[PDB]
Amino acid sequence: MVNLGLSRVDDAVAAKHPGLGEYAACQSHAFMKGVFTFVTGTGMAFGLQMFIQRKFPYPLQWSLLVAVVAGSVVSYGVTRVESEKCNNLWLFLETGQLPKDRSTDQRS
Protein backbone atom coordinates (compact mmCIF):
# COMPACT_ATOMS: atom_id res chain seq x y z
CA MET A 1 0.00 0.00 0.00
CA VAL A 2 1.15 3.50 -0.87
CA ASN A 3 0.79 6.12 1.83
CA LEU A 4 3.41 8.77 1.17
CA GLY A 5 6.50 8.31 -0.97
CA LEU A 6 6.58 7.90 -4.73
CA SER A 7 3.20 9.60 -4.66
CA ARG A 8 4.63 12.96 -3.68
CA VAL A 9 7.60 12.32 -5.93
CA ASP A 10 5.38 11.67 -8.93
CA ASP A 11 3.27 14.67 -7.99
CA ALA A 12 6.35 16.85 -7.67
CA VAL A 13 7.45 15.65 -11.09
CA ALA A 14 4.02 16.45 -12.48
CA ALA A 15 4.38 19.95 -11.09
CA LYS A 16 7.64 20.06 -13.00
CA HIS A 17 6.14 18.62 -16.17
CA PRO A 18 2.85 20.42 -16.86
CA GLY A 19 0.90 18.21 -19.24
CA LEU A 20 -1.09 15.41 -17.65
CA GLY A 21 -1.40 16.78 -14.14
CA GLU A 22 -2.26 20.16 -15.59
CA TYR A 23 -4.98 18.70 -17.78
CA ALA A 24 -6.33 16.67 -14.89
CA ALA A 25 -6.50 19.71 -12.63
CA CYS A 26 -7.87 21.68 -15.56
CA GLN A 27 -10.52 18.99 -15.80
CA SER A 28 -11.58 19.05 -12.17
CA HIS A 29 -11.25 22.82 -12.35
CA ALA A 30 -13.61 23.17 -15.29
CA PHE A 31 -16.12 20.81 -13.72
CA MET A 32 -15.78 22.55 -10.38
CA LYS A 33 -16.21 25.87 -12.14
CA GLY A 34 -19.50 24.83 -13.71
CA VAL A 35 -20.67 23.35 -10.42
CA PHE A 36 -19.75 26.60 -8.71
CA THR A 37 -21.71 28.63 -11.23
CA PHE A 38 -24.67 26.31 -10.85
CA VAL A 39 -24.66 26.13 -7.07
CA THR A 40 -24.24 29.89 -7.02
CA GLY A 41 -27.00 30.03 -9.61
CA THR A 42 -29.39 30.56 -6.73
CA GLY A 43 -27.85 33.57 -5.04
CA MET A 44 -31.22 35.29 -5.20
CA ALA A 45 -32.06 33.72 -1.86
CA PHE A 46 -28.91 35.21 -0.38
CA GLY A 47 -29.83 38.48 -2.05
CA LEU A 48 -33.15 38.74 -0.26
CA GLN A 49 -31.66 37.60 3.03
CA MET A 50 -28.90 40.13 2.52
CA PHE A 51 -31.28 42.99 1.84
CA ILE A 52 -33.24 42.15 4.97
CA GLN A 53 -29.99 41.53 6.81
CA ARG A 54 -28.87 45.00 5.79
CA LYS A 55 -31.51 46.25 8.20
CA PHE A 56 -28.95 45.64 10.92
CA PRO A 57 -26.74 48.34 12.44
CA TYR A 58 -23.91 45.85 12.11
CA PRO A 59 -21.37 45.66 9.27
CA LEU A 60 -21.38 41.92 8.70
CA GLN A 61 -24.71 40.24 8.08
CA TRP A 62 -25.84 37.28 10.15
CA SER A 63 -26.16 35.56 6.79
CA LEU A 64 -22.67 36.61 5.79
CA LEU A 65 -21.35 35.69 9.22
CA VAL A 66 -23.04 32.30 9.10
CA ALA A 67 -22.05 31.95 5.46
CA VAL A 68 -18.49 32.83 6.41
CA VAL A 69 -18.27 30.62 9.47
CA ALA A 70 -20.29 27.87 7.83
CA GLY A 71 -18.47 28.59 4.59
CA SER A 72 -15.12 28.14 6.30
CA VAL A 73 -16.02 24.95 8.12
CA VAL A 74 -17.95 23.61 5.15
CA SER A 75 -15.04 24.73 3.01
CA TYR A 76 -12.67 22.58 5.02
CA GLY A 77 -14.91 19.53 4.98
CA VAL A 78 -15.69 19.93 1.30
CA THR A 79 -11.97 20.45 0.79
CA ARG A 80 -11.25 17.20 2.60
CA VAL A 81 -13.69 15.19 0.51
CA GLU A 82 -12.80 17.18 -2.58
CA SER A 83 -9.12 16.72 -1.87
CA GLU A 84 -9.44 13.00 -1.23
CA LYS A 85 -11.55 12.54 -4.34
CA CYS A 86 -9.57 15.04 -6.37
CA ASN A 87 -6.53 13.11 -5.22
CA ASN A 88 -7.94 9.74 -6.22
CA LEU A 89 -8.94 11.35 -9.50
CA TRP A 90 -5.46 12.80 -9.88
CA LEU A 91 -4.05 9.30 -9.51
CA PHE A 92 -6.66 7.86 -11.84
CA LEU A 93 -5.90 10.49 -14.46
CA GLU A 94 -2.21 9.94 -13.84
CA THR A 95 -2.81 6.30 -14.68
CA GLY A 96 -4.99 7.06 -17.68
CA GLN A 97 -8.10 5.58 -16.10
CA LEU A 98 -11.44 5.85 -17.85
CA PRO A 99 -12.63 9.37 -18.67
CA LYS A 100 -15.69 11.13 -17.31
CA ASP A 101 -17.08 13.67 -19.75
CA ARG A 102 -19.48 16.27 -18.41
CA SER A 103 -21.64 19.17 -19.52
CA THR A 104 -21.24 22.79 -18.47
CA ASP A 105 -21.93 25.27 -21.24
CA GLN A 106 -21.07 28.21 -19.02
CA ARG A 107 -22.36 31.73 -19.52
CA SER A 108 -21.27 35.26 -18.69
Give me the residue spans of the domains in the chain.
1-108
Breaks, C-N > 2.5 A, in the chain lie after: none
Neighbours of 90 (CB within 10 A): 21
Quote the radius of gyration of the chain (alpha carbons, Å).
Answer: 19
- Phi then psi dihedrals of residue 63, to 5 deg: -70, -40
Residues 6+ positions from 50 with CB-CB distance below 8 Å? 61, 63, 64
What's the CATH number for 1-108? 1.10.3350.20
* Torsion of the alpha carbons at 83, 84, 88 and 93, rounded to the nearest 10: -10
Amino acid at 108: S
Neighbours of 93 (CB within 10 A): 20
Rounded CA separation 106/108 (Å) = 7
Quote the DSSP letter at residue 42: G
Rounded CA separation 101/58 (Å) = 46
Q: Is the dihedral of CA 91, 97, 103, 108 positive or negative?
A: positive
Contact 28, 20 (CB under 8 A): no
Contact 10, 94 (CB under 8 A): yes
Taking Cα atoms as reference points, which of 108, 75, 95, 92 lies closest to residue 28? Answer: 92
